[model samples]
Target: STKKTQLQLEHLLLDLQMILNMLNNYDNPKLTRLLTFKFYMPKKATSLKHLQCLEEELKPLEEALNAAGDDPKTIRDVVSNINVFVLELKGSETTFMCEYADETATIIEFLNRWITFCQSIISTLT
Candidate 1:
């Protein structure tokens, strides 16, 4: 029941938090090295949580666009954009784990630590 825009924003934030939590606790030397590559190739390492947080952050603007309701195509474009990012992140996560794994725990730890830090920062802002 999409009764309120605030509720939808909260739901989006929660999902973003969950993703961040997964990234923060990841710990493994090999994975750390891989993530360090992120230092050089930031786009690859760019946190989706940060981008997704923007969706909630810009909820007001989204609401404005929704209210105008004249450009149905614009609304559709926003939805499409969000959907693409979500799918991109899903694919990226799989590629990351597959490419970086020396051991299962290694990859898990990397994800955990990274996500935890992201979640913390985002939480602070809210």
Candidate 2:
């Protein structure tokens, strides 16, 4: 029984470490790159690719959510909606439309909400 408890504790610590790393990574250069490509560049195929890359970059957040259970469903739903928006961008062949601009604004709003949630978690960690 003691051995089982130790193993469980070990797993829990590892999970905590991973979640911390994921939170830190959000402020890294990769996110800056995403923001630059998303807003500054011409809305070309390359820009769409960058948007898709943002979804991939979010894998750590997804893993954290999966490992810890959804304590904040709103943030989880926001993350999912952002992923869907990126998918729609990736599926399209044309450049930006007025609708795309509006959709991008919505995605950015959700991103702000997501980041706010992350900040709350990081505050708790500190």
Candidate 3:
């Protein structure tokens, strides 16, 4: 019904704002390494459960975009397909920040974690 989801995912993210600085202060070379490439930090925030939803939807597209590697059109096809689940933003342009998108990164566990995490989210109740 879409009714079960909360509109404000920030109920989860507001606190994370503090933690990102904590991670930033330490500034490990590898820490922001993957977080560094691609994706935007987002002007909006969200709840943990809800973000699992966003993370879930985005990664499938992200992987192929990386593997698709340099062909903007192939990347566009993948994102265009996955774009719907993220919400009504129908544009592939809606799915990414072009300025940050050209290269990709590898963070095995985070990718796996979110894939599984969001995999569950996208399983959808029907």
Candidate 4:
């Protein structure tokens, strides 16, 4: 209904960046081993909630885009396929058992896509 969702996506991207930065800060070999395992589940839950919220925000936009009916084909295609990305994100979160680096990389990838999607929407609206 509004561009507030775009702002939310921006904030989500910032949060993901902070998370990634924090992950990077834990790179000392000894600390990496201990703290990475320590922080995994807590951050996993937080990221899952963020992802769910992102998906919920996106649904209304998808509907609006579909209803708009005049958006370009590429925009429509990207919006249409977002659910698959979200599904993969959720699956990755659910089955995340090990490898903190890979998990965070996966999270960053999802966040980047949503950030780009929001930019594309802005591009279209302008």
Candidate 5:
């Protein structure tokens, strides 16, 4: 009952690119590299899990988010989407959620709402 790793990886890269596209950024050369970095499918693509390429690719964004976190954080906190997500995480491990979500609306909700919050922040940043 397992999917082919290589075939799954093709979609993985595609979805990865799509998210990066969704998270468009500006002015940081290092972030430009992070955004532009490509993860080629390994030649014998099987999950030995040694190289940690995905973890490496993601750390900078985590660091950036972390840095942004401690810098006058409540400004973003006042905005609802980022704030709500932070709240969402606080209880995830010990929290209760419904067994199912409806109509994929939660996914759809985030895309529009996330963009809306960022745009709200951007309105005054420049």
Candidate 6:
């Protein structure tokens, strides 16, 4: 599943953040370039596709909910939506890293945006 890979990437991001925070002089141009190069290796399109695929997968569930029916599958779909949003948050992290490889400000911006997006998605699932 994409969740496993995303989890690995999330760990990598946290480690990178910790390492950066410990640096005495993190403003080095060369260091910035190297970090950007490392993160830029992963393109946004890949995760974009995952989000699109999950969104498509959600359509049927919404339709089922629209129909006059109450079943265990509906509950399962709700759980799946929650799972999907977690994956979406992971994908957003990749986008966050890829776009804001240099400046911490950009990362902060993405975090705020992601928090809102995640909350919205979670609201639907509940």
Better model by lDDT, 2 or 3?
2
Q: Deviation in angstroms for 28 in model 4?
A: 2.6
Listed in order, each prediction's TM-score against the native is 0.27, 0.31, 0.32, 0.31, 0.26, 0.24
Q: Who wins the TM-score comparison?
A: 3
Hey, what RMSD does candidate 1 come out at?
Answer: 16.3
After the best TM-score superposition of candidate 4, give how far the Cα of residue 63 lies from its true spot, in angstroms.
Answer: 35
- The TM-score that candidate 2 achieves is 0.31
Q: Write the per-residue lDDT of candidate 3 for residues 42-109, one digit (tens) a residue.
A: 23222232332344435543553344234556445544443443343222233442222233444433
lDDT winner, 3 or 5: 3
Tens-digit lDDT track of model 1 for 1-126: 223423433444454444335335444542354343221111223454333323332344334334433455654555455444444443323333212223323323433444454454445445
How much lDDT does each candidate structure score? Answer: 0.39, 0.41, 0.37, 0.42, 0.33, 0.37
Off by over 4 Å in 5: 1-3, 23-51, 65-126
User: What 10-residue stretch in candidate 6 is worst by lDDT?
Assistant: 34-43
Clashes of each: 19, 0, 5, 0, 0, 0
Deviation of model 3 at 73, angstroms:
0.9
Q: Estimate candidate 5's alpha-carbon lDDT, on a 0 to 1 scale.
A: 0.33
Lowest-lDDT window of 10 residues in candidate 3?
Answer: 6-15
- lDDT by residue (1-126, candidate 4, tens digit) is 235544444444454444345435543552334232211112232343334445543444434333324344643555445544554444434344322322322333444555554455545434
Clashing pairs in 3: 9-46, 9-47, 10-46, 10-47, 12-47
Q: How well does candidate 4 score on lDDT at residue 37?
A: 24
Clashing pairs in 6: none
**Model 2, 9-90: lDDT tens per residue?**
3433343344445444564454443333232111222233444434553554454444333346644654565555455544
Model 2 clash number: 0
